[PDB]
């Protein structure tokens, strides 16, 4: 149970500030962590802050352009990406965790007093995670999606079942939500994830398999909504042979 800020879109070279926190004064005794999730590349631990506040460590990869912080008065935590590149387009996770703190070294006075001591922190777990914040880095500008029909035909029919769909092409940025018959058509619907084209614009395909008995009987309209361009699109898919 951790709440983070909404998704972010940045032109290259700029900076993005990401916030995250539990409700109120919940997990003050839990350490702050930041994990990076690149879709299809794995999980990445960036850095951490001790709940005591005597530690703030950042991994060499992110050392140059990343800042972590936490002002204890609002209890709220922050992550800062600067000098953004295209390779910084990833999902950023915050996490609260427990740990072990055991003294590894000690140096004493000649009369017994402790002169110097070093502690070592051992990660126990990351128990509480945030919803996640998506950061997108591109030179592209906001562009409304072109919607084209995937017509059902003789070639797109197997047995007694046919398939049609909408093709959402060349938009920016994500996300695009696709519906069929305003939510009335649910069974057999397959909406694939958007693919990043060579242009820098996304393309998306939403399909649904229907019996050929319905092609004349029923009407199949896809609703394509794209908030960033303030566009909602209704397109009717017909069988044109």
């Amino acid at each position: 149970q951790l709440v983070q800020s909404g998704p972010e879109v940045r032109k290259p070279g700029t900076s993005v500030k990401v916030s995250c926190k539990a409700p109120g004064n919940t997990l003050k005794t839990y350490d702050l962590h930041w994990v990076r999730s690149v879709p299809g590349q794995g999980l990445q631990w960036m850095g951490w802050i001790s709940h005591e506040g005597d530690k703030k460590v950042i991994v060499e990869r992110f050392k140059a352009k990343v800042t972590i912080d936490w002002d204890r008065s609002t209890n709220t935590a922050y992550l800062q990406l600067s000098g953004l590149t295209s390779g910084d387009t990833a999902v950023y996770y915050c996490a609260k965790g427990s740990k072990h703190r055991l003294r590894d070294y000690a140096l004493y006075d000649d009369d017994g007093a402790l002169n110097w001591a070093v502690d070592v922190d051992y990660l126990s777990n990351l128990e509480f995670w945030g919803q996640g914040t998506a950061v997108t880095v591109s030179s592209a500008s906001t562009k409304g999606p072109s919607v084209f029909p995937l017509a059902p035909s003789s070639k797109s029919t197997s047995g007694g079942t046919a398939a049609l769909g909408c093709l959402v092409k060349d938009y920016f940025p994500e996300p695009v939500t696709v519906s069929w018959n305003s939510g009335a058509l649910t069974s057999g619907v397959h909406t694939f994830p958007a693919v990043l084209q060579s242009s820098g614009l996304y393309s998306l395909s939403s399909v649904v398999t229907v019996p050929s008995s319905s092609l004349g009987t029923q009407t199949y309209i896809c609703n394509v909504n794209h908030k960033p361009s303030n566009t909602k699109v209704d397109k009717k898919v017909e069988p044109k042979s």
Partner: protein
């Protein structure tokens, strides 16, 4: 390093799944403390904790999840696997700095093999009017996720001008769907006659070519 195994995993429902994590160096400090944890990241969800200190179950975590091993060899065991458990699992160490994750393990629900019905869609008149040609091949409801797709234009296979995506595994029938999109210029599109989607899959008795004639 942390080396997690296997890279991919498929479990017939109601069986047991064993994922391993192996450290080059010791993960024990002091008395008997193995600082290695296990996590899940289900599709569309944030990571969530399963096991910590090698063998300790987190709160609200089903009894089927267990941890074992020590020092170097570590194993996550999921038994009585259900549809809920599908996702990517990660191991994480907390001994040496910096703390790192495992490379991940895609856990999959294994069903009986299902061949895909392959569909094909020519470029619409609406899109051709806009000066671009996009050809779509659709493979529906198949298992496993591994499918090989090739685009032939005048029986010359296309390379570097197509890109595909797969749906997440459907919870109902445990199958996938693939949508490949071949993009061509309007000029190049009408300079060629036949367009085909050559699909190979385990379920298929023989490689399937869904083709249409331009015009």
């Amino acid at each position: 390093v942390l080396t997690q195994s296997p890279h991919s995993l498929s479990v017939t429902p109601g069986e047991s799944a064993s994922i391993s994590c192996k450290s080059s160096h010791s993960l024990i400090h002091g008395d008997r403390n193995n600082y290695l944890a296990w996590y899940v990241q289900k599709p569309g969800r944030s990571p969530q904790l399963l096991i910590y200190l090698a063998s300790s179950r987190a709160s609200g975590v089903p009894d089927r999840f267990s941890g074992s091993g020590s020092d170097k060899d570590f194993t996550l065991k999921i038994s009585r696997v259900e549809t809920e458990d599908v996702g990517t699992y990660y191991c994480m160490q907390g001994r040496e700095s910096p703390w790192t994750f495992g490379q991940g393990t895609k856990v999959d629900i294994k069903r009986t093999v299902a061949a895909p019905s392959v569909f094909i869609f020519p470029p619409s008149d609406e899109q051709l009017k806009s000066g671009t040609a996009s050809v779509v091949c659709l493979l529906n409801n198949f298992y496993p996720r591994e499918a090989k797709v090739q685009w032939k234009v005048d029986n010359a296979l296309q390379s570097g001008n197509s890109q595909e995506s797969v749906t997440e595994q459907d919870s109902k029938d445990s199958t996938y769907s693939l949508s490949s999109t071949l993009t061509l210029s309007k000029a190049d599109y009408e300079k060629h006659k036949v367009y085909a989607c050559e699909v190979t899959h385990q379920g298929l008795s023989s490689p399937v070519t869904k083709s249409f004639n331009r015009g």
